[model samples]
Target: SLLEFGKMILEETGKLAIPSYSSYGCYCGWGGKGTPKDATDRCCFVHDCCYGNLPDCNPKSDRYKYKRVNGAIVCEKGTSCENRICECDKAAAICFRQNLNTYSKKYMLYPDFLCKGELKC
Candidate 1:
């Protein structure tokens, strides 16, 4: 059915049922919550929307310093403000210890949008 749908969306716009916009977003990795919030300046992983039932996930997670990589802010593993003044965090320490045999940087930012107020440390 998917391959048939891919034949042409506009050609079958009136033929299809339900708003395929959600699926379109899903295919694009935007997902289907459709919260319709401020997406300007927000980015994937570094900044993105939350979609789930009302269960909390430590909301205010540990803060970590991110560095510019390929021109975007992201976790820099295995070191701190040694090469320069780095923004730091407990997650950084954890990631440093946890992430070995790794290549890319990965960590979390707190408060985010789902969480209330940002953590200052």
Candidate 2:
């Protein structure tokens, strides 16, 4: 199904618009409910339209850094140094869509549009 969609998109645009995710901003990353905000001064991680916290990683701390790859922003394992700069490693997949509704919302779809399986367009 994705292949068909990709082919159609390429045919129409003459170029492939690859799927990707956005980077985590000041509030991007993981944490618990009412968890203390990091130095970036945000309480939640920002990815596309999703806002939440990540466990064991903090953008404002000395543990992680944000990187823009392809067309998506991802968290790369890294360390923070004395100059407030982050040293990153290979990119890691921390966030992902857990359900159809979340996937559609992340892609910004109308409420009635359902993916996978034919029900209605």
Candidate 3:
């Protein structure tokens, strides 16, 4: 479990997992073949790993829901699970921004290795 393992690291050393440790390229999405294509893809890989760390947390998880406050959507504070998931997403978002220049539309296309017959995008 990515979450469990990462949590262990934090409790023992008070340090976050290094992003490079999980750079599997465009993971948790279509159109990737193992290694990351660029820095942007690396971000996605880390994000995937981050999510994997929290086994029970997913898009459908209740922990991620936001509450409406004065008509404005707001995330509740001090919820450990929600906060952890948000931290992963936020880190990935910033990583993509920092590596925007390396992003390419071709990265969205399915890779040749992933298909044996005629490749379809």
Candidate 4:
């Protein structure tokens, strides 16, 4: 269900948020927090949701761990796990592109209190 949810974001507009599948604003990575200065950060929010799908996957270390062999980037954990992460990343990347017009570099470091439980989800 989570993988399919991730795939939907990947393949479709994915502009809206789904409850439980995603939290509000940019709570990127494992614990990175902000209220999303733009849609780009919202992309990260969705990315976090996509990662939330996989119980066996570690959101922090599992992403981008790979080896380059013969000029191709090879996934370190083999197909099943890596491919799933790749799907989530690709979806988020797409989301980033779609929202690029509203993107701001400043938002990347902008902090928020909600993600830290200063306010409720």
Superior by TM-score: candidate 1 or candidate 2: 1
Residues 34-98 of candidate 4: C-alpha lDDT, one tens digit per residue = 45545665677667667767778754455344444774334455557667786676566457557
lDDT (Cα, tens digit) per residue for candidate 1, span 20-114: 22122111123223232222112121112221211332222322234545643344452332212122222222222232333121212212244
- TM-score preference between candidates 2 and 4, better one: 4
Give the alpha carbon lDDT tens digit for every residue of 1-121 in model 2.
2233233334333434243221122222222222212321121222211211223343333333444577444445544231122211111122222221232213321122222222110
In model 3, the Cα lDDT at residue 12 comes to 30
The deviation in Å at residue 81 for candidate 1 is: 21
Q: Which residue runs of candidate 1 sit more than 4 Å off their true CA positions?
A: 1-61, 78-121
Residue-wise C-alpha lDDT for candidate 3, range 1-121, written one tens digit per residue: 3454343333333334344223234452533346656676667667767766878765324344334466433445646677677667556655655665665556554454643332112
Error of 2 at 19 (Å): 27
Could you tell me the lDDT of residue 32 within candidate 4?
51
Worst 10 residues of 2 by lDDT: 82-91
- Best TM-score among the predictions, by candidate number: 3
Candidate 2 at 118: error in angstroms?
35
Error of 2 at 84 (Å): 18
Query: After aligning candidate 1 to the native by TM-score, how far in Å is the CA of 86 from where it should be?
Result: 15
For all candidates in order, the CA lDDT equals 0.25, 0.27, 0.51, 0.52
Q: What CA RMSD would you report for each candidate?
A: 18.7, 15.0, 12.6, 10.3
TM-score of each: 0.21, 0.19, 0.55, 0.52
- Model 4: what TM-score? 0.52
Stretches of candidate 2 off by over 4 Å are 1-63, 80-121
